[PDB]
Amino acid sequence: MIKEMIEDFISKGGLIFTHSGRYTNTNNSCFIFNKNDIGVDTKVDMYTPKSAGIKNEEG
DNA sequence: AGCAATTTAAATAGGGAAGATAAGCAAAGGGTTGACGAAAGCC
């Protein structure tokens, strides 16, 4: 399910971003979602504390 | 005690043999490098 997942994300810290300083330093935790660069094939990153979240039937 | 000459021509061709093989092993490791969240003493 997808809504189940979006809400699983929201019960947690719940950040979706296209740019971050988390890659520069893992202790940083700055997450930035730019709106202008979202396109058809724009890959999009997300953050959860310790990457938590349930999986689907396909894992 | 330096003086030692000039031109001219330097071979055309025919051949550079194929047949064989070119190992099989067994190794090639992991040891550290984790940030948030949550109890839990402690100024």
Side-chain angles (χ1 to χ4, degrees), chain A residues 6-48:
Chain A
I6 305 278
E7 284 146 358
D8 146 78
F9 220 79
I10 225 19
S11 74
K12 299 147 165 51
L15 296 205
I16 291 185
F17 56 96
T18 38
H19 314 265
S20 190
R22 187 54 99 111
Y23 315 120
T24 309
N25 205 293
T26 309
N27 300 280
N28 165 239
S29 85
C30 158
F31 311 98
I32 292 305
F33 189 83
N34 194 13
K35 299 211 211 55
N36 304 7
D37 75 306
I38 292 296
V40 159
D41 40 17
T42 296
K43 298 266 151 293
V44 153
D45 213 311
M46 331 184 258
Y47 173 68
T48 318

mmCIF file of all heavy atoms in Angstrom, chain A residues 6-48:
data_model
loop_
_atom_site.group_PDB
_atom_site.id
_atom_site.type_symbol
_atom_site.label_atom_id
_atom_site.label_comp_id
_atom_site.label_asym_id
_atom_site.label_seq_id
_atom_site.Cartn_x
_atom_site.Cartn_y
_atom_site.Cartn_z
ATOM 1 N N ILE A 6 3.010 6.322 3.367
ATOM 2 C CA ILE A 6 3.258 7.732 3.550
ATOM 3 C C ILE A 6 2.954 8.076 4.997
ATOM 4 O O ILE A 6 3.589 8.934 5.592
ATOM 5 C CB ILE A 6 2.460 8.609 2.569
ATOM 6 C CG1 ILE A 6 2.739 8.194 1.132
ATOM 7 C CG2 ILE A 6 2.840 10.073 2.697
ATOM 8 C CD1 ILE A 6 4.013 8.774 0.572
ATOM 9 N N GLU A 7 2.006 7.374 5.590
ATOM 10 C CA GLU A 7 1.649 7.664 6.960
ATOM 11 C C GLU A 7 2.596 6.974 7.907
ATOM 12 O O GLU A 7 2.759 7.407 9.042
ATOM 13 C CB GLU A 7 0.215 7.260 7.249
ATOM 14 C CG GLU A 7 -0.814 8.213 6.677
ATOM 15 C CD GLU A 7 -2.067 7.496 6.222
ATOM 16 O OE1 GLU A 7 -2.108 6.251 6.316
ATOM 17 O OE2 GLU A 7 -3.011 8.176 5.773
ATOM 18 N N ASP A 8 3.231 5.902 7.457
ATOM 19 C CA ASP A 8 4.231 5.239 8.279
ATOM 20 C C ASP A 8 5.348 6.228 8.384
ATOM 21 O O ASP A 8 5.909 6.436 9.453
ATOM 22 C CB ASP A 8 4.700 3.960 7.595
ATOM 23 C CG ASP A 8 6.153 3.648 7.853
ATOM 24 O OD1 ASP A 8 6.470 3.155 8.956
ATOM 25 O OD2 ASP A 8 6.978 3.880 6.943
ATOM 26 N N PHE A 9 5.655 6.879 7.276
ATOM 27 C CA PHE A 9 6.683 7.883 7.278
ATOM 28 C C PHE A 9 6.342 9.050 8.178
ATOM 29 O O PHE A 9 7.206 9.566 8.870
ATOM 30 C CB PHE A 9 6.851 8.393 5.863
ATOM 31 C CG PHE A 9 8.258 8.629 5.485
ATOM 32 C CD1 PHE A 9 9.063 7.572 5.130
ATOM 33 C CD2 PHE A 9 8.780 9.902 5.505
ATOM 34 C CE1 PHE A 9 10.368 7.783 4.778
ATOM 35 C CE2 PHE A 9 10.087 10.122 5.166
ATOM 36 C CZ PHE A 9 10.882 9.056 4.816
ATOM 37 N N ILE A 10 5.090 9.473 8.185
ATOM 38 C CA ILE A 10 4.724 10.654 8.950
ATOM 39 C C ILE A 10 4.702 10.426 10.469
ATOM 40 O O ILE A 10 4.999 11.349 11.210
ATOM 41 C CB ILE A 10 3.481 11.343 8.334
ATOM 42 C CG1 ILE A 10 3.665 12.864 8.255
ATOM 43 C CG2 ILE A 10 2.200 10.998 9.079
ATOM 44 C CD1 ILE A 10 5.097 13.342 8.350
ATOM 45 N N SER A 11 4.287 9.260 10.958
ATOM 46 C CA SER A 11 4.412 8.933 12.377
ATOM 47 C C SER A 11 5.844 9.075 12.873
ATOM 48 O O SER A 11 6.071 9.330 14.061
ATOM 49 C CB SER A 11 3.913 7.513 12.639
ATOM 50 O OG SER A 11 4.841 6.554 12.164
ATOM 51 N N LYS A 12 6.812 8.901 11.987
ATOM 52 C CA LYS A 12 8.220 9.112 12.284
ATOM 53 C C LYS A 12 8.591 10.550 11.918
ATOM 54 O O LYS A 12 7.711 11.407 11.808
ATOM 55 C CB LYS A 12 9.048 8.039 11.584
ATOM 56 C CG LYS A 12 8.674 6.659 12.072
ATOM 57 C CD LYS A 12 8.791 5.622 10.995
ATOM 58 C CE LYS A 12 8.770 4.238 11.603
ATOM 59 N NZ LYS A 12 7.619 4.056 12.522
ATOM 60 N N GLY A 13 9.896 10.833 11.797
ATOM 61 C CA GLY A 13 10.363 12.204 11.608
ATOM 62 C C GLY A 13 9.852 12.850 10.335
ATOM 63 O O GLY A 13 9.514 14.037 10.318
ATOM 64 N N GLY A 14 9.792 12.083 9.254
ATOM 65 C CA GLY A 14 8.948 12.446 8.134
ATOM 66 C C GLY A 14 9.432 13.515 7.180
ATOM 67 O O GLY A 14 8.705 14.475 6.908
ATOM 68 N N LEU A 15 10.636 13.354 6.636
ATOM 69 C CA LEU A 15 11.242 14.369 5.784
ATOM 70 C C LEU A 15 11.513 13.800 4.401
ATOM 71 O O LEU A 15 12.103 12.725 4.271
ATOM 72 C CB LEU A 15 12.532 14.892 6.413
ATOM 73 C CG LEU A 15 12.413 15.632 7.750
ATOM 74 C CD1 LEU A 15 13.565 16.546 7.883
ATOM 75 C CD2 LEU A 15 11.149 16.464 7.876
ATOM 76 N N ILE A 16 11.056 14.512 3.377
ATOM 77 C CA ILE A 16 11.327 14.202 1.978
ATOM 78 C C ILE A 16 12.081 15.383 1.386
ATOM 79 O O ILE A 16 11.650 16.532 1.534
ATOM 80 C CB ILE A 16 10.025 13.922 1.207
ATOM 81 C CG1 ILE A 16 9.401 12.603 1.668
ATOM 82 C CG2 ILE A 16 10.262 13.919 -0.281
ATOM 83 C CD1 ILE A 16 8.180 12.182 0.868
ATOM 84 N N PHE A 17 13.207 15.110 0.727
ATOM 85 C CA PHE A 17 14.117 16.165 0.312
ATOM 86 C C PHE A 17 14.777 15.814 -1.015
ATOM 87 O O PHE A 17 14.895 14.642 -1.393
ATOM 88 C CB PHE A 17 15.198 16.435 1.378
ATOM 89 C CG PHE A 17 16.003 15.223 1.762
ATOM 90 C CD1 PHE A 17 17.229 14.977 1.171
ATOM 91 C CD2 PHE A 17 15.548 14.340 2.727
ATOM 92 C CE1 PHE A 17 17.969 13.869 1.522
ATOM 93 C CE2 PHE A 17 16.286 13.233 3.068
ATOM 94 C CZ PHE A 17 17.499 13.001 2.472
ATOM 95 N N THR A 18 15.212 16.859 -1.717
ATOM 96 C CA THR A 18 15.990 16.717 -2.936
ATOM 97 C C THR A 18 17.439 17.140 -2.765
ATOM 98 O O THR A 18 18.265 16.825 -3.628
ATOM 99 C CB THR A 18 15.369 17.542 -4.067
ATOM 100 O OG1 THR A 18 14.871 18.778 -3.542
ATOM 101 C CG2 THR A 18 14.237 16.779 -4.706
ATOM 102 N N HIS A 19 17.758 17.864 -1.697
ATOM 103 C CA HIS A 19 19.119 18.263 -1.387
ATOM 104 C C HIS A 19 19.340 18.099 0.107
ATOM 105 O O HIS A 19 18.422 18.324 0.898
ATOM 106 C CB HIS A 19 19.397 19.716 -1.789
ATOM 107 C CG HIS A 19 18.906 20.071 -3.157
ATOM 108 N ND1 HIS A 19 19.711 20.018 -4.272
ATOM 109 C CD2 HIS A 19 17.691 20.481 -3.589
ATOM 110 C CE1 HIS A 19 19.016 20.385 -5.332
ATOM 111 N NE2 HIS A 19 17.786 20.667 -4.946
ATOM 112 N N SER A 20 20.556 17.717 0.491
ATOM 113 C CA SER A 20 20.863 17.566 1.905
ATOM 114 C C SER A 20 22.354 17.679 2.156
ATOM 115 O O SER A 20 23.170 17.324 1.302
ATOM 116 C CB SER A 20 20.392 16.224 2.449
ATOM 117 O OG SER A 20 20.491 16.215 3.856
ATOM 118 N N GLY A 21 22.695 18.166 3.342
ATOM 119 C CA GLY A 21 24.035 18.090 3.868
ATOM 120 C C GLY A 21 24.310 16.828 4.639
ATOM 121 O O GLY A 21 25.375 16.696 5.250
ATOM 122 N N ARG A 22 23.353 15.896 4.647
ATOM 123 C CA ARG A 22 23.533 14.618 5.319
ATOM 124 C C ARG A 22 24.589 13.768 4.628
ATOM 125 O O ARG A 22 25.279 12.977 5.282
ATOM 126 C CB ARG A 22 22.191 13.884 5.378
ATOM 127 C CG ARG A 22 22.179 12.614 6.185
ATOM 128 C CD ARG A 22 22.684 12.858 7.582
ATOM 129 N NE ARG A 22 21.614 13.015 8.556
ATOM 130 C CZ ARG A 22 21.342 12.137 9.509
ATOM 131 N NH1 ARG A 22 22.018 11.008 9.621
ATOM 132 N NH2 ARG A 22 20.374 12.402 10.378
ATOM 133 N N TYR A 23 24.740 13.926 3.314
ATOM 134 C CA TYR A 23 25.772 13.194 2.592
ATOM 135 C C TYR A 23 27.162 13.726 2.911
ATOM 136 O O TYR A 23 28.137 12.963 2.915
ATOM 137 C CB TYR A 23 25.504 13.268 1.096
ATOM 138 C CG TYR A 23 24.063 13.027 0.734
ATOM 139 C CD1 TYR A 23 23.317 13.996 0.079
ATOM 140 C CD2 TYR A 23 23.447 11.828 1.053
ATOM 141 C CE1 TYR A 23 22.001 13.770 -0.254
ATOM 142 C CE2 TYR A 23 22.142 11.593 0.724
ATOM 143 C CZ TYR A 23 21.422 12.564 0.075
ATOM 144 O OH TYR A 23 20.116 12.310 -0.240
ATOM 145 N N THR A 24 27.279 15.033 3.156
ATOM 146 C CA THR A 24 28.571 15.609 3.517
ATOM 147 C C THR A 24 29.002 15.153 4.902
ATOM 148 O O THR A 24 30.160 14.776 5.116
ATOM 149 C CB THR A 24 28.501 17.133 3.448
ATOM 150 O OG1 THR A 24 27.962 17.529 2.181
ATOM 151 C CG2 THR A 24 29.883 17.739 3.610
ATOM 152 N N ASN A 25 28.077 15.172 5.856
ATOM 153 C CA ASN A 25 28.341 14.730 7.215
ATOM 154 C C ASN A 25 27.097 14.033 7.730
ATOM 155 O O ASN A 25 25.993 14.569 7.609
ATOM 156 C CB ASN A 25 28.706 15.911 8.116
ATOM 157 C CG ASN A 25 29.533 15.500 9.308
ATOM 158 O OD1 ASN A 25 29.059 14.789 10.192
ATOM 159 N ND2 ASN A 25 30.780 15.950 9.345
ATOM 160 N N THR A 26 27.271 12.842 8.300
ATOM 161 C CA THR A 26 26.122 12.086 8.780
ATOM 162 C C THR A 26 25.573 12.679 10.077
ATOM 163 O O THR A 26 24.387 12.515 10.381
ATOM 164 C CB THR A 26 26.527 10.615 8.941
ATOM 165 O OG1 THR A 26 27.141 10.173 7.725
ATOM 166 C CG2 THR A 26 25.321 9.726 9.136
ATOM 167 N N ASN A 27 26.390 13.432 10.812
ATOM 168 C CA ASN A 27 25.945 14.118 12.018
ATOM 169 C C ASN A 27 25.187 15.407 11.725
ATOM 170 O O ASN A 27 24.707 16.046 12.668
ATOM 171 C CB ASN A 27 27.143 14.442 12.912
ATOM 172 C CG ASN A 27 27.899 13.209 13.343
ATOM 173 O OD1 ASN A 27 27.497 12.512 14.271
ATOM 174 N ND2 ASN A 27 29.008 12.931 12.669
ATOM 175 N N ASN A 28 25.070 15.808 10.460
ATOM 176 C CA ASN A 28 24.533 17.121 10.124
ATOM 177 C C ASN A 28 23.018 17.175 10.285
ATOM 178 O O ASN A 28 22.502 17.944 11.103
ATOM 179 C CB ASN A 28 24.924 17.493 8.695
ATOM 180 C CG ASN A 28 24.117 18.645 8.154
ATOM 181 O OD1 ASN A 28 23.441 18.516 7.140
ATOM 182 N ND2 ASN A 28 24.196 19.787 8.822
ATOM 183 N N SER A 29 22.303 16.360 9.502
ATOM 184 C CA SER A 29 20.837 16.297 9.450
ATOM 185 C C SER A 29 20.213 17.646 9.075
ATOM 186 O O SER A 29 19.495 18.271 9.854
ATOM 187 C CB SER A 29 20.238 15.764 10.759
ATOM 188 O OG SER A 29 20.087 16.809 11.702
ATOM 189 N N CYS A 30 20.509 18.087 7.854
ATOM 190 C CA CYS A 30 19.800 19.184 7.206
ATOM 191 C C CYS A 30 19.215 18.670 5.903
ATOM 192 O O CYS A 30 19.951 18.163 5.054
ATOM 193 C CB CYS A 30 20.720 20.365 6.924
ATOM 194 S SG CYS A 30 20.133 21.470 5.622
ATOM 195 N N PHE A 31 17.904 18.811 5.739
ATOM 196 C CA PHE A 31 17.190 18.197 4.626
ATOM 197 C C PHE A 31 16.327 19.242 3.939
ATOM 198 O O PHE A 31 15.488 19.878 4.583
ATOM 199 C CB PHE A 31 16.348 17.017 5.111
ATOM 200 C CG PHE A 31 17.103 16.051 5.979
ATOM 201 C CD1 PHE A 31 17.006 16.109 7.354
ATOM 202 C CD2 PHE A 31 17.936 15.105 5.417
ATOM 203 C CE1 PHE A 31 17.689 15.223 8.149
ATOM 204 C CE2 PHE A 31 18.631 14.213 6.206
ATOM 205 C CZ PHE A 31 18.510 14.275 7.575
ATOM 206 N N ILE A 32 16.521 19.399 2.632
ATOM 207 C CA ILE A 32 15.957 20.501 1.863
ATOM 208 C C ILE A 32 15.258 19.948 0.629
ATOM 209 O O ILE A 32 15.878 19.253 -0.182
ATOM 210 C CB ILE A 32 17.055 21.502 1.459
ATOM 211 C CG1 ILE A 32 17.605 22.234 2.685
ATOM 212 C CG2 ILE A 32 16.565 22.451 0.413
ATOM 213 C CD1 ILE A 32 16.554 22.931 3.514
ATOM 214 N N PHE A 33 13.976 20.277 0.473
ATOM 215 C CA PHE A 33 13.194 19.872 -0.695
ATOM 216 C C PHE A 33 13.011 21.089 -1.594
ATOM 217 O O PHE A 33 12.245 22.000 -1.274
ATOM 218 C CB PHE A 33 11.851 19.287 -0.272
ATOM 219 C CG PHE A 33 11.075 18.658 -1.399
ATOM 220 C CD1 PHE A 33 11.339 17.359 -1.796
ATOM 221 C CD2 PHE A 33 10.069 19.358 -2.044
ATOM 222 C CE1 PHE A 33 10.626 16.774 -2.822
ATOM 223 C CE2 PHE A 33 9.354 18.776 -3.072
ATOM 224 C CZ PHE A 33 9.634 17.484 -3.460
ATOM 225 N N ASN A 34 13.718 21.104 -2.720
ATOM 226 C CA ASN A 34 13.554 22.160 -3.709
ATOM 227 C C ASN A 34 12.391 21.806 -4.626
ATOM 228 O O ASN A 34 12.260 20.655 -5.057
ATOM 229 C CB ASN A 34 14.838 22.352 -4.508
ATOM 230 C CG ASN A 34 14.843 23.640 -5.300
ATOM 231 O OD1 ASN A 34 14.012 24.520 -5.086
ATOM 232 N ND2 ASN A 34 15.786 23.759 -6.227
ATOM 233 N N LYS A 35 11.540 22.790 -4.918
ATOM 234 C CA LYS A 35 10.342 22.529 -5.704
ATOM 235 C C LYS A 35 10.590 22.651 -7.200
ATOM 236 O O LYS A 35 9.910 21.986 -7.989
ATOM 237 C CB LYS A 35 9.230 23.489 -5.291
ATOM 238 C CG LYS A 35 8.815 23.381 -3.841
ATOM 239 C CD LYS A 35 7.342 23.712 -3.669
ATOM 240 C CE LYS A 35 7.073 24.345 -2.313
ATOM 241 N NZ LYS A 35 7.927 25.542 -2.083
ATOM 242 N N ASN A 36 11.546 23.490 -7.606
ATOM 243 C CA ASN A 36 11.699 23.820 -9.019
ATOM 244 C C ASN A 36 12.326 22.684 -9.811
ATOM 245 O O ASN A 36 12.049 22.541 -11.006
ATOM 246 C CB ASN A 36 12.538 25.085 -9.174
ATOM 247 C CG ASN A 36 11.964 26.257 -8.416
ATOM 248 O OD1 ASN A 36 11.008 26.107 -7.657
ATOM 249 N ND2 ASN A 36 12.544 27.433 -8.616
ATOM 250 N N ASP A 37 13.157 21.868 -9.175
ATOM 251 C CA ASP A 37 13.882 20.824 -9.882
ATOM 252 C C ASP A 37 13.113 19.511 -9.968
ATOM 253 O O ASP A 37 13.672 18.520 -10.448
ATOM 254 C CB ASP A 37 15.239 20.574 -9.221
ATOM 255 C CG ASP A 37 15.118 19.811 -7.920
ATOM 256 O OD1 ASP A 37 14.357 20.260 -7.040
ATOM 257 O OD2 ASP A 37 15.776 18.758 -7.779
ATOM 258 N N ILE A 38 11.862 19.468 -9.512
ATOM 259 C CA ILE A 38 11.107 18.222 -9.579
ATOM 260 C C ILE A 38 10.619 18.047 -11.010
ATOM 261 O O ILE A 38 9.899 18.896 -11.546
ATOM 262 C CB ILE A 38 9.929 18.226 -8.598
ATOM 263 C CG1 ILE A 38 10.423 18.191 -7.153
ATOM 264 C CG2 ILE A 38 9.055 16.998 -8.839
ATOM 265 C CD1 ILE A 38 11.153 16.951 -6.774
ATOM 266 N N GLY A 39 11.020 16.952 -11.643
ATOM 267 C CA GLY A 39 10.579 16.678 -12.993
ATOM 268 C C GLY A 39 10.010 15.287 -13.143
ATOM 269 O O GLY A 39 9.569 14.678 -12.165
ATOM 270 N N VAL A 40 10.013 14.784 -14.377
ATOM 271 C CA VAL A 40 9.479 13.456 -14.654
ATOM 272 C C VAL A 40 10.385 12.383 -14.059
ATOM 273 O O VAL A 40 9.920 11.461 -13.377
ATOM 274 C CB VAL A 40 9.290 13.278 -16.173
ATOM 275 C CG1 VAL A 40 9.236 11.806 -16.568
ATOM 276 C CG2 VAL A 40 8.039 14.009 -16.636
ATOM 277 N N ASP A 41 11.693 12.505 -14.275
ATOM 278 C CA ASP A 41 12.658 11.511 -13.826
ATOM 279 C C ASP A 41 13.551 12.040 -12.708
ATOM 280 O O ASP A 41 14.735 11.706 -12.642
ATOM 281 C CB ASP A 41 13.504 11.025 -15.002
ATOM 282 C CG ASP A 41 13.876 12.145 -15.954
ATOM 283 O OD1 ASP A 41 13.770 13.326 -15.562
ATOM 284 O OD2 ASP A 41 14.271 11.844 -17.099
ATOM 285 N N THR A 42 12.999 12.864 -11.823
ATOM 286 C CA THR A 42 13.766 13.403 -10.706
ATOM 287 C C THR A 42 13.732 12.405 -9.558
ATOM 288 O O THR A 42 12.678 12.174 -8.957
ATOM 289 C CB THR A 42 13.206 14.752 -10.268
ATOM 290 O OG1 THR A 42 13.364 15.700 -11.331
ATOM 291 C CG2 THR A 42 13.938 15.258 -9.040
ATOM 292 N N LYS A 43 14.879 11.802 -9.261
ATOM 293 C CA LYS A 43 14.986 10.941 -8.095
ATOM 294 C C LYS A 43 14.936 11.781 -6.826
ATOM 295 O O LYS A 43 15.462 12.893 -6.766
ATOM 296 C CB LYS A 43 16.274 10.124 -8.147
ATOM 297 C CG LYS A 43 16.345 9.184 -9.332
ATOM 298 C CD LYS A 43 15.838 7.802 -8.972
ATOM 299 C CE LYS A 43 15.239 7.105 -10.179
ATOM 300 N NZ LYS A 43 13.995 7.777 -10.642
ATOM 301 N N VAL A 44 14.276 11.244 -5.808
ATOM 302 C CA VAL A 44 13.931 12.017 -4.625
ATOM 303 C C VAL A 44 14.293 11.206 -3.392
ATOM 304 O O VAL A 44 13.981 10.016 -3.294
ATOM 305 C CB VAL A 44 12.433 12.402 -4.663
ATOM 306 C CG1 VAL A 44 11.857 12.593 -3.282
ATOM 307 C CG2 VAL A 44 12.253 13.659 -5.484
ATOM 308 N N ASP A 45 14.972 11.853 -2.447
ATOM 309 C CA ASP A 45 15.435 11.156 -1.263
ATOM 310 C C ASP A 45 14.527 11.448 -0.082
ATOM 311 O O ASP A 45 13.754 12.407 -0.081
ATOM 312 C CB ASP A 45 16.845 11.556 -0.893
ATOM 313 C CG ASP A 45 17.610 10.434 -0.281
ATOM 314 O OD1 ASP A 45 17.075 9.798 0.651
ATOM 315 O OD2 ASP A 45 18.727 10.169 -0.762
ATOM 316 N N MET A 46 14.587 10.573 0.919
ATOM 317 C CA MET A 46 13.819 10.755 2.139
ATOM 318 C C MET A 46 14.624 10.297 3.348
ATOM 319 O O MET A 46 15.554 9.498 3.231
ATOM 320 C CB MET A 46 12.476 10.016 2.117
ATOM 321 C CG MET A 46 11.784 9.787 0.798
ATOM 322 S SD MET A 46 10.208 9.030 1.086
ATOM 323 C CE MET A 46 10.711 7.397 0.638
ATOM 324 N N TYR A 47 14.273 10.849 4.507
ATOM 325 C CA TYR A 47 14.965 10.588 5.763
ATOM 326 C C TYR A 47 13.982 10.106 6.815
ATOM 327 O O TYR A 47 12.890 10.664 6.958
ATOM 328 C CB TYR A 47 15.677 11.837 6.284
ATOM 329 C CG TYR A 47 16.258 11.671 7.669
ATOM 330 C CD1 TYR A 47 17.332 10.820 7.893
ATOM 331 C CD2 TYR A 47 15.736 12.367 8.750
ATOM 332 C CE1 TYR A 47 17.866 10.663 9.155
ATOM 333 C CE2 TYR A 47 16.268 12.219 10.020
ATOM 334 C CZ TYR A 47 17.331 11.363 10.215
ATOM 335 O OH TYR A 47 17.864 11.209 11.470
ATOM 336 N N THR A 48 14.378 9.071 7.541
ATOM 337 C CA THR A 48 13.748 8.587 8.753
ATOM 338 C C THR A 48 14.854 8.339 9.766
ATOM 339 O O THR A 48 15.986 8.044 9.372
ATOM 340 C CB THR A 48 12.971 7.292 8.484
ATOM 341 O OG1 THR A 48 12.257 7.423 7.247
ATOM 342 C CG2 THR A 48 11.975 6.996 9.583
#
